[PDB]
């Protein structure tokens, strides 16, 4: 709402880079945590059986 | 209170030199711009010079370019004016003024204007005055008022003061401005308007005082015949 596209684009690109890398960090940590929970669920299924 | 006490003026022969001083008190001297302005006797104002704090940004009027040098001082806070190669046209009363053109663009004018110092460029020497009375006509019947006065002649320099009868008679005292003669010496006349009937009864004594020479004279006036 305050910058023209030719210069707003640089600020937006910086914000895009920061939020996309933050999202990638969240997703990677979620993938590892999901693998840990999956191992626990497999152990729980084995214990149940 | 702003105070620009000026000094250093006096009598100089043509082609000589003289330094004027302008002390300052009551304000920040180092943060203001100082000027010199002179006025010929009975003529209009003419700017002389200006120094805006720095010892290199000095500006002078066209009539004094090259001959006059301006300078200032820290510590005691005074202003100086060097005069070289003076001519008869340079006789004037020199004033030092203020100015805050530096930052302020409103008080561009000369806020104070010192009282001024008198500089006379002449080869004549200092001389005390000669005093002569102004006698009336005894058979004057034009009116009930007769005119009397004392003529102070050939004094140099100014100023003079006039009193009468040690202050006991002050009615009708009139002092005239001094004039310059062709002889190079100044002249002045001080007169008093009085009733005519008191010429032969009351004693009229005029008192003239001149501070630069500390001369006091008392003269009595008597009608003729």
């Amino acid at each position: 709402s305050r910058l023209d596209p030719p210069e707003a684009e640089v600020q937006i690109d910086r914000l895009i880079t920061g939020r996309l890398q933050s999202l990638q960090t969240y997703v990677t940590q979620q993938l590892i945590r999901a693998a840990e929970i999956r191992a626990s669920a497999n152990l729980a299924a084995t214990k149940m059986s | 209170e702003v105070q620009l006490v000026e000094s250093g003026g006096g009598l100089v022969q043509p082609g000589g030199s003289l330094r004027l001083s302008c002390a300052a008190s009551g304000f920040t001297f180092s943060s203001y711009a100082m000027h010199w302005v002179r006025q010929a006797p009975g003529k209009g104002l003419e700017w002389v010079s200006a120094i805006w704090g720095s010892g290199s940004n000095t500006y002078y009027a066209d009539s004094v370019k090259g001959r006059f040098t301006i300078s200032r001082d820290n510590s005691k806070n005074t202003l100086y004016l060097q005069m070289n190669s003076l001519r008869a046209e340079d006789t004037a009363v020199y004033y030092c003024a203020r100015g805050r053109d530096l930052a302020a663009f409103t008080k561009t004018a000369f806020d104070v204007w010192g009282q001024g110092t008198l500089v006379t460029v002449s080869s004549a020497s200092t001389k005390g005055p000669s005093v002569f009375p102004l006698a009336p006509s005894s058979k004057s019947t034009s009116g009930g008022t007769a005119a009397l006065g004392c003529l102070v002649k050939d004094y140099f320099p100014e100023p003079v003061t006039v009193s009468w009868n040690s202050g006991a008679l002050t009615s009708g005292v009139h002092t005239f401005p001094a004039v310059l003669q062709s002889s190079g010496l100044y002249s002045l006349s001080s007169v008093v308007t009085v009733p005519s009937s008191s010429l032969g009864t009351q004693t009229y004594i005029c008192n003239v005082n001149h501070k630069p020479s500390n001369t006091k004279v008392d003269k009595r006036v008597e009608p003729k015949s």
């Binding site: 305050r2 023209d4 707003a8 | 930052a103 663009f105």
Partner: protein
């Protein structure tokens, strides 16, 4: 304005409680340079300070 302070002691006028139309002043071409940092010279009318 008629005067303008010197650069060592520049003037600072405070503007508040008023409506600032920047489209008229921008649409003049009388200016030798007009560089805006922060916000674009355009659309500045839809902003508040």
């Amino acid at each position: 304005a008629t005067r303008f302070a010197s650069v060592y002691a520049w003037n600072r006028k405070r503007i508040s409680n008023c409506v600032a139309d920047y489209s008229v002043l921008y649409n003049s071409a009388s200016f030798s340079t007009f560089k805006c940092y922060g916000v674009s010279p355009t659309k500045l009318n839809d902003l508040c300070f």
